[PDB]
């Protein structure tokens, strides 16, 4: 950590790991999103699988989560491909932390969404089949919960290799503070 040249390499490695983790997370979000299209199509016909209300309850904020993480991933990727002491990533993490309101809504609704989805998988024929081959549904619904709980861990892991002389340091420290406050509020 005291050798800033090694620290630069370690910081790139952590950022590369964050990219890989976001790729995996975006795939899980896509897996949840894909059945929404036929479900919303059938909901407005005389042969609905789930009602629009049940769809909105189960899949609440999943598109919004996908959008903010796609923005973060797409912003971070080119910076890691052009890595140097000059490179700055802090604004991307501040932007994601500014969007934690999406997670607050999702987490507040998670228990209802989980129950609603468990009911239908235990009783509804076509939806139980949908939840069986999601690129389960309840497993994927926990991914946003499990992940944001680890947000301060990854930020600390990145800060460990960011020197106080680098202008990303105050931005990452502030994103960590805001994320800690969010976890405390939950």
């Amino acid at each position: 950590e005291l050798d800033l040249e090694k620290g630069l390499e370690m910081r790139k490695w952590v950022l590369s790991g964050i990219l890989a983790s976001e790729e995996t997370y975006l795939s899980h979000l896509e897996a949840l999103l894909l059945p929404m299209k036929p479900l919303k199509a059938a909901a407005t016909t005389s042969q609905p699988v789930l009602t629009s209300q049940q769809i909105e309850t189960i899949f609440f904020k999943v598109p919004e989560l996908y959008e903010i993480h796609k923005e973060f991933y797409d912003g971070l990727f080119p910076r890691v491909q052009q890595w140097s002491h000059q490179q700055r990533v802090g604004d991307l993490f501040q932007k994601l932390a500014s969007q934690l309101g999406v997670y607050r809504a999702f987490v507040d609704n998670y228990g209802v969404a989980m129950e609603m989805a468990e009911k239908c998988c235990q009783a509804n024929a076509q939806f139980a089949e949908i939840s069986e081959n999601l690129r389960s549904l309840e497993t994927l619904l926990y991914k946003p919960v499990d992940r944001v709980t680890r947000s301060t861990l990854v930020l600390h892991d990145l800060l460990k290799h960011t020197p106080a002389s680098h202008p990303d340091h105050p931005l990452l420290q502030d994103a960590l503070r805001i994320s800690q406050n969010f976890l405390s509020s939950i």
Binding site: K6, W13, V14, G17, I18, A20, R150, L153, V154, D157
Partner: protein, 93 residues
């Protein structure tokens, strides 16, 4: 030195580790990286790393869990191909 020394974890994410060691003074033909939960809740696994490297990324790990990590070095400079003294560390993710 003739065998890998000074194995350490030099960076981490909640589910992954970067290990690093001092490369030996031989041409390494192949590295094998071995890792598993120290307590046996999941099986030991291995993967290969080219002899031109002296670091490795281990991913897919459980957070907050003790792991044992071992590096094996194969070299045609070694009498029985695999080095006489593999090196191991423990690390809590």
């Amino acid at each position: 030195s003739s065998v890998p020394t000074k194995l350490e974890v030099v960076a981490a994410t909640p589910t992954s580790l970067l290990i690093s060691w001092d490369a030996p003074a031989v041409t390494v033909d192949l590295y094998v990286i071995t890792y598993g939960e120290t307590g046996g809740n999941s099986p030991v696994q291995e993967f290969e790393v080219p002899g031109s490297k002296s670091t490795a990324t281990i991913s897919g790990l459980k957070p907050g869990v003790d792991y044992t990590i071992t590096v094996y070095a194969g070299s045609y400079a070694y009498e029985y191909y695999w080095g006489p003294s593999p090196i191991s560390i423990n690390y809590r993710t």
